[PDB]
Amino acid sequence: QSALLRTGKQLFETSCVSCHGANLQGVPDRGPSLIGTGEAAVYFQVSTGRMPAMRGEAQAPSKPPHFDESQIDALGAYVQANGGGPTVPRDDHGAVAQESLIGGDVARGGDLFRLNCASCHNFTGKGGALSSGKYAPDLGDANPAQIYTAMLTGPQNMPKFSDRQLTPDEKRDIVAYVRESAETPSYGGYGLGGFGPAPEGMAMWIIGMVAAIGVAMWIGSRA
Amino acid sequence: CSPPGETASSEPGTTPAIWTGSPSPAAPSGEDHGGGHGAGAAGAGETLTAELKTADGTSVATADFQFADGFATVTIETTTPGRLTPGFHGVHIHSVGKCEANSVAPTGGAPGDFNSAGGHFQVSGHSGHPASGDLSSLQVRADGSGKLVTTTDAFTAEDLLDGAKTAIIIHEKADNFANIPPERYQQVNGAPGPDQTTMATGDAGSRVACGVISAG
Amino acid sequence: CSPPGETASSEPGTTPAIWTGSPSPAAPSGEDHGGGHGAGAAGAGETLTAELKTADGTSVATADFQFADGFATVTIETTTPGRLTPGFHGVHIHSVGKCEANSVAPTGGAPGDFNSAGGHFQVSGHSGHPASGDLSSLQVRADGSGKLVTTTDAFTAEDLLDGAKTAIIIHEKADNFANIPPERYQQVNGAPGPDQTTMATGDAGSRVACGVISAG
Amino acid sequence: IKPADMHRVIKRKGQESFNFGELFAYTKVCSHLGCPSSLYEQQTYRILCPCHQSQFDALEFAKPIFGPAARALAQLPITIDEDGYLVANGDFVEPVGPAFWERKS
Ligand SMILES: CC(C)=CCC/C(C)=C/CC/C(C)=C\CC/C(C)=C/CC/C(C)=C/CC/C(C)=C/CC/C(C)=C\CC/C(C)=C/CC/C(C)=C/CC1=C(C)C(=O)c2ccccc2C1=O
Ligand SMILES: CCCCCCCCCCCCCCCC(=O)O[C@H](COC(=O)CCCCCCC[C@@H](C)CCCCCCCCC)COP(=O)(O)O[C@H]1[C@H](O)[C@H](O)[C@H](O)[C@@H](O)[C@@H]1O
Ligand SMILES: CCCCCCCCCCCCCCCC(=O)O[C@H](COC(=O)CCCCCCC[C@@H](C)CCCCCCCCC)COP(=O)(O)O[C@H]1[C@H](O)[C@H](O)[C@H](O)[C@@H](O)[C@@H]1O
Ligand code: HEC
Ligand code: FES
Numbered sequence: 001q002s003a004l005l006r007t008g009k010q011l012f013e014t015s016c017v018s019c020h021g022a023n024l025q026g027v028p029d030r031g032p033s034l035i036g037t038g039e040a041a042v043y044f045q046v047s048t049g050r051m052p053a054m055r056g057e058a059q060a061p062s063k064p065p066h067f068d069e070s071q072i073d074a075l076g077a078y079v080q081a082n083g084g085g086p087t088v089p090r091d092d093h094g095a096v097a098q099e100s101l102i103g104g105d106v107a108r109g110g111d112l113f114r115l116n117c118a119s120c121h122n123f124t125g126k127g128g129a130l131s132s133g134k135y136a137p138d139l140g141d142a143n144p145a146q147i148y149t150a151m152l153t154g155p156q157n158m159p160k161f162s163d164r165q166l167t168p169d170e171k172r173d174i175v176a177y178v179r180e181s182a183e184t185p186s187y188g189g190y191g192l193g194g195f196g197p198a199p200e201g202m203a204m205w206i207i208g209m210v211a212a213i214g215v216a217m218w219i220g221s222r223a
Numbered sequence: 224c225s226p227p228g229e230t231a232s233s234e235p236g237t238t239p240a241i242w243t244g245s246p247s248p249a250a251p252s253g254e255d256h257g258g259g260h261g262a263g264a265a266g267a268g269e270t271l272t273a274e275l276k277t278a279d280g281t282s283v284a285t286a287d288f289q290f291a292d293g294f295a296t297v298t299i300e301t302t303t304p305g306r307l308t309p310g311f312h313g314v315h316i317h318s319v320g321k322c323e324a325n326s327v328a329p330t331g332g333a334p335g336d337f338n339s340a341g342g343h344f345q346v347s348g349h350s351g352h353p354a355s356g357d358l359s360s361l362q363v364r365a366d367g368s369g370k371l372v373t374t375t376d377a378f379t380a381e382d383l384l385d386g387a388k389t390a391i392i393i394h395e396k397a398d399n400f401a402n403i404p405p406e407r408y409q410q411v412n413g414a415p416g417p418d419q420t421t422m423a424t425g426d427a428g429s430r431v432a433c434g435v436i437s438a439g
Numbered sequence: 440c441s442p443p444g445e446t447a448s449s450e451p452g453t454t455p456a457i458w459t460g461s462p463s464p465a466a467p468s469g470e471d472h473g474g475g476h477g478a479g480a481a482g483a484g485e486t487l488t489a490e491l492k493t494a495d496g497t498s499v500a501t502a503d504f505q506f507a508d509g510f511a512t513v514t515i516e517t518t519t520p521g522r523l524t525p526g527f528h529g530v531h532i533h534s535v536g537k538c539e540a541n542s543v544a545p546t547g548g549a550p551g552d553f554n555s556a557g558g559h560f561q562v563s564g565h566s567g568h569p570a571s572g573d574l575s576s577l578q579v580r581a582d583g584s585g586k587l588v589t590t591t592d593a594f595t596a597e598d599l600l601d602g603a604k605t606a607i608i609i610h611e612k613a614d615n616f617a618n619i620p621p622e623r624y625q626q627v628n629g630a631p632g633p634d635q636t637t638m639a640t641g642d643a644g645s646r647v648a649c650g651v652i653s654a655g
Numbered sequence: 656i657k658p659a660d661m662h663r664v665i666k667r668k669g670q671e672s673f674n675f676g677e678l679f680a681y682t683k684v685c686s687h688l689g690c691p692s693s694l695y696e697q698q699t700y701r702i703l704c705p706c707h708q709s710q711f712d713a714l715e716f717a718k719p720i721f722g723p724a725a726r727a728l729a730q731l732p733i734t735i736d737e738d739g740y741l742v743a744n745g746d747f748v749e750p751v752g753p754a755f756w757e758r759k760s
Contacts, residue, residue, distance in 0.1 A: 119693035119705055130694065131701050131710050131721075157696040294582070311569055311616065353527055353613075359576035360614065362569070364592045366510070372588035376580045397569075398576065399618035400527065402642050409625055426618050442726050442759060444749065445667050445718065452671030455734040458742045 008078025011071055015052055024082040035083025037153055039076030043088040043096065044149035047072050058133025059156050069096065086152050086163065088145060098145045102176040103169065109177030112170055124181045126194035130157060140182040147175040257438065262290065267380035273391055275302065275434035276322045278335050283432035284369065286391040290380035298372040299361045299391065307363035313398030313427045314358035314371060316344035320388035320435035336392050336433035342424035344389045346382065353400055357425065360398050383436055392433040399426035473654065478506065483596035489607055491518065491650035492538045494551050499523065499648035500585065502607040506596035514588040515577045515607065523579035529614030529643045530574035530587060532560035536604035536651035552608050552649035558640035560605045562598065569616055573641065576614045599652055608649040615642035660700065660714065667716045669748055673732040680731035681717045682751050685709060686724035689753035702728065726754060
């Protein structure tokens with residue numbers, strides 16, 4: 001719909017053209033180019049909230065979303081009409097598909113998440129550190145369509161795991177893993193983060209060892 | 224103590240009747256459909272065989288025509304040991320798929336397996352040269368078996384699933400398909416060229432075997 | 440310290456030339472002979488293909504005739520995209536295997552691929568009906584490919600390795616093999632029956648493709 | 656590598672033709688202490704390792720930008736095969752894993 005493209009243009013003019021130049025270009029050393037990134041890229045970068053941003057820093061972090069689903073389709077179709085690239089997967093309603101993306105396998109998703117990317121984040125999808133200030137974020141507060149469009153067009157410092165690098169079966173399979181690894185409870189106690197031994201150490205000292213020394217000073221006297 | 228379940232010699236058993244082994248509902252999580260292919264059209268599969276029936280209802284041969292990679296692969300194998308005669312047989316695709324014992328679509332004498340609405344099962348706009356109705360020979364040697372595997376790209380799976388289903392037939396003679404040279408031969412009316420009946424289908428006898436290609 | 444083997448920017452490299460990968464002498468503990476079979480005779484294998492050569496030395500088709508289970512399987516596939524013409528082609532086994540450009544065994548005009556010592560490569564005592572010399576059709580559609588896989592049990596691997604090697608040929612026309620009915624047709628001499636040249640081999644044009652079956 | 660950033664690349668010795676246009680193949684096992692350096696940062700082009708957080712420059716050749724590593728992480732040569740498939744154009748020029756005594760001569 002052309003009125004939807006116009007709505008995307010009206011939201012485009014009054015949020016970003018200080019850093020995208022209003023011809024969908026890149027304002028040099030203030031905000032990069034934007035054509036070719038596409039509706040999938042704009043869905044992940046505004047549906048998470050990140051790109052209607054406020055400073056150019058180590059990496060632009062997560063935030064509350066600056067537009068809603070009635071307007072992300074407008075903004076992403078506007079950037080795809082000006083440019084053109086990956087598109088967000090949509091179900092039989094025309095809306096953004098978020099539940100039909102969980103694939104039928106998890107163990108293949110476990111091995112593929114673990115090989116291809118869990119170097120950067122974590123095993124269950126907690127965050128991980130990156131080089132100069134930038135960091136991987138947690139995958140717990142991640143809409144499955146945002147996970148698919150996160151790996152589909154890689155925003156900041158992550159490789160864009162393309163439609164041909166990972167097949168959509170594999171990408172549905174990875175988002176089946178992470179929406180049932182950051183959602184399944186920690187089997188057998190409190191989950192001290194997701195990454196193991198450093199929270200287990202710090203919760204050995206102040207929970208276990210401080211209680212042990214407190215028992216040891218209640219039992220023995222002092223002199 | 225002695226165990227209770229022993230020591231009883233009756234008449235020493237019937238011989239065990241031959242193991243007619245039942246099929247396997249361990250594999251049965253799957254239903255064999257018509258097949259899997261592309262064919263961005265009304266819709267078809269990639270495997271549809273045929274059973275060539277004679278004038279007594281018995282099987283004579285077995286055809287398998289299917290579109291695989293834009294080329295209609297047709298493999299005609301034998302079914303009976305003593306069905307065909309000692310000679311070459313001419314395969315021909317008929318437009319109507321009725322393998323009746325005595326039927327005729329037009330006004331005329333109903334021959335064996337002549338239920339077609341004409342001769343060769345050509346295209347809907349083709350009436351001339353050797354189209355998909357005419358086929359290669361499946362010759363029968365002294366062993367009594369005629370096998371012919373060919374790839375005709377004239378038709379496909381979207382052309383065999385028409386409003387009237389087609390068939391594959393084999394007569395008692397070979398496949399000529401207007402093989403009369405006009406430089407030495409002659410006609411009964413003195414014409415140099417061939418007849419229109421020899422141009423529609425090959426010069427053979429009556430159709431002995433015929434089978435509908437609608438997954439027969 | 441800094442490691443010694445670094446930091447040298449020349450002109451930044453030619454683009455890497457396409458990987459023409461060498462074959463594998465890891466598998467090479469094995470020599471591919473003519474084949475393995477039974478054939479309790481002078482001795483033969485189970486695989487012997489052919490390369491159909493034209494009048495310019497170029498390949499047109501490719502035959503593969505071999506004895507497997509007492510039935511001579513012959514598969515004739517295409518080699519070139521635009522070799523054959525738009526029509527049916529008649530395969531015929533020739534007695535002599537010379538695929539010469541212009542040769543004639545008898546006293547006469549040397550035609551294309553006519554180096555055979557007669558017509559059909561029949562048995563050593565056979566001269567009549569459709570023996571192993573005559574073959575089924577390998578028709579060429581508009582795509583320009585003629586494929587025909589048949590099983591003729593008239594000859595075997597012990598008959599193709601004769602004193603003179605045989606060949607497989609295809610003319611510019613189809614395979615007739617005396618398909619003239621004597622009830623409506625007529626000869627130039629008024630005879631009801633067919634000619635002896637049409638009884639030896641089929642009625643076609645000049646032989647376009649020909650290939651020796653001695654593992655060509 | 657994004658082809659807007661192919662003018663920032665400076666190859667090292669014996670290694671100028673080990674690209675394939677813009678396809679580079681650096682090993683995953685890092686310079687020292689052999690963990691897989693499977694963190695990769697586009698738009699800064701740094702192969703970061705997780706085990707000790709040692710960056711490597713993806714642009715020039717995997718020289719350590721920063722970290723406890725001091726050696727260039729090894730690069731694999733690339734060509735395409737007949738039928739157009741990515742193949743290795745031989746072996747690494749240096750031993751690829753972590754360092755030890757018998758090395759670098
Ligand atoms: C006593 C001292 C070690 C002298 C030895 C002689 C010395 C000259 C030998 C040479 C050592 C020098 C050259 C290098 C240092 C290397 C070091 C000593 C390795 C050896 C291992 C071992 C001996 C370590 C020292 C002993 C250890 C630190 C004593 C614990 C600290 C105190 C005194 C105990 C009470 C603390 C208890 C009440 C809990 C309080 C909570 C605080 C926040 C705990 C601090 C804390 C600790 C200590 C963690 O290990 C830790 C690990 C992972 C996550 C978090 C934490 C964490 O928060
Ligand atoms: C009594 C009857 C017996 C009942 C059993 C009691 C034992 C507990 C186990 C029972 C199941 C509960 C575990 C739940 C399952 C679980 O793992 O616990 C998560 C961890 O989350 C959090 O931290 C938030 C929790 C905050 C609560 C308070 C924190 C605990 C403190 C006290 C620990 C002390 C550690 C030492 C401090 C160091 C001192 C420093 C000076 C919380 O899950 P949730 O909040 O819903 O979502 C996750 C996201 O947190 C997560 O970021 C996301 O990534 C996903 O994991 C998501 O699932
Ligand atoms: C009982 C005493 C306690 C010592 C225990 C271990 C010693 C065992 C010695 C037995 C073997 C002796 C030489 C024959 C074994 C042999 O030939 O190899 C040597 C393998 O010995 C080694 O592991 C370690 C020593 C290497 C030789 C010299 C080391 C000592 C001196 C040279 C270092 C002190 C002075 C320098 C600085 C000192 C410190 C700072 C100042 C050197 O490796 P490499 O040189 O890399 O040669 C490769 C071929 O292996 C492979 O086939 C082939 O592919 C080649 O391409 C190559 O890779
Ligand atoms: C450095 C290597 C890197 C790897 C590889 C990588 N990520 Fe990312 N990921 C990041 C960074 C950095 C961000 C944040 C980008 C931003 O904030 O604009 C991110 C963002 C995300 C988010 C958004 C989190 C949120 O709160 O919305 C998700 C989900 C995610 N990645 C999952 C994945 C998936 C899925 C893969 C592919 C299987 C992957 N990561 C691979 C580093 C990486
Ligand atoms: S382990 Fe990766 S560099 Fe030390």
